[PDB]
Amino acid sequence: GTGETLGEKWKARLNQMSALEFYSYKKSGITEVCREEARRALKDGVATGGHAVSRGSAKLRWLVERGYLQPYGKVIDLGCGRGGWSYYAATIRKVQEVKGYTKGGPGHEEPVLVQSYGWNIVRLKSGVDVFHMAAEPCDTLLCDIGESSSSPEVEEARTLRVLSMVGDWLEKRPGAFCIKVLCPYTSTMMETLERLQRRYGGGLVRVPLSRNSTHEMYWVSGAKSNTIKSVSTTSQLLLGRMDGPRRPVKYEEDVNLGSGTRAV
Numbered sequence: 001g002t003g004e005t006l007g008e009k010w011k012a013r014l015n016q017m018s019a020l021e022f023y024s025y026k027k028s029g030i031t032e033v034c035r036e037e038a039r040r041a042l043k044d045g046v047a048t049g050g051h052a053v054s055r056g057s058a059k060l061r062w063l064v065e066r067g068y069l070q071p072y073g074k075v076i077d078l079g080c081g082r083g084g085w086s087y088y089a090a091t092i093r094k095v096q097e098v099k100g101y102t103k104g105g106p107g108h109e110e111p112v113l114v115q116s117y118g119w120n121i122v123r124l125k126s127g128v129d130v131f132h133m134a135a136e137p138c139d140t141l142l143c144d145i146g147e148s149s150s151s152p153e154v155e156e157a158r159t160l161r162v163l164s165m166v167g168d169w170l171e172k173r174p175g176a177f178c179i180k181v182l183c184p185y186t187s188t189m190m191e192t193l194e195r196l197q198r199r200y201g202g203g204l205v206r207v208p209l210s211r212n213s214t215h216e217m218y219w220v221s222g223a224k225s226n227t228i229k230s231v232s233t234t235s236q237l238l239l240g241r242m243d244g245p246r247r248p249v250k251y252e253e254d255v256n257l258g259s260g261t262r263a264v
């Protein structure tokens with residue numbers, strides 16, 4: 001054992017921040033979409049304005065527009081929340097069907113019904129515990145599950161749980177996948193991830209729309225890389241942003257998902 005990884009040092013420093021320091025650090029220098037227009041239109045019940053239902057659509061757009069994920073066919077979206085990934089996937093030409101599942105209930109996101117482009121091929125189901133769902137074949141497997149915790153043992157336990165569950169779906173051989181890895185940086189987790197890459201491929205990618213307060217990376221089929229290096233690079237990035245003054249957010253215009261239905 002070589003002791004403490006950079007990500008463990010990052011997490012320990014994060015937990016030593018005051019609420020003020022934490023607040024300024026959380027968005028320092030990150031990329032963000034402005035959600036003002038969408039938030040207003042969704043509150044007014046507007047379903048045809050092209051608005052994304054969450055910040056998640058922009059996160060998936062960042063991966064897809066770079067070719068790190070190429071969705072196609074039957075898309076399964078585990079932990080779909082409001083549906084940002086499912087509605088984004090529905091606009092993609094090679095996608096033909098989107099099934100999203102999410103827990104819902106008090107304190108959790110419920111699916112939002114809008115009519116962005118391709119809404120007629122989307123089915124979102126709440127009240128579903130995905131850890132009790134029998135895996136089934138699909139072409140594209142998405143999972144965005146992993147709730148942040150100030151305890152790294154809790155984040156590790158939660159990440160191992162997600163990875164064990166998605167393994168059963170990946171055994172059905174989807175050709176594309178995008179899996180949130182909440183806590184990728186412990187030595188045990190990195191050995192687990194490399195074993196999973198040897199069986200299923202892919203690599204981990206840091207999305208710049210992620211907040212500095214989480215070390216989340218996305219395991220995606222379209223960006224194979226050395227996970228030791230990709231995780232360490234992200235840890236160094238996040239540690240460096242803890243020094244020096246708070247830096248401006250890079251604001252982007254949010255996703256326009258259009259409107260209308262798709263043929264078959």
Ligand SMILES: Nc1ncnc2c1ncn2[C@@H]1O[C@H](CSCC[C@H](N)C(=O)O)[C@@H](O)[C@H]1O
Nearest residue numbers: 054056079081084085102103109129130144
């Ligand atoms: N056991 C479980 N079964 C189903 N959903 C779960 C779950 N545990 C957590 N979740 C859900 O997974 C979601 C992850 S956040 C999903 C955001 C989504 N990608 C978007 O773009 O909008 C949360 O809404 C959470 O409630």
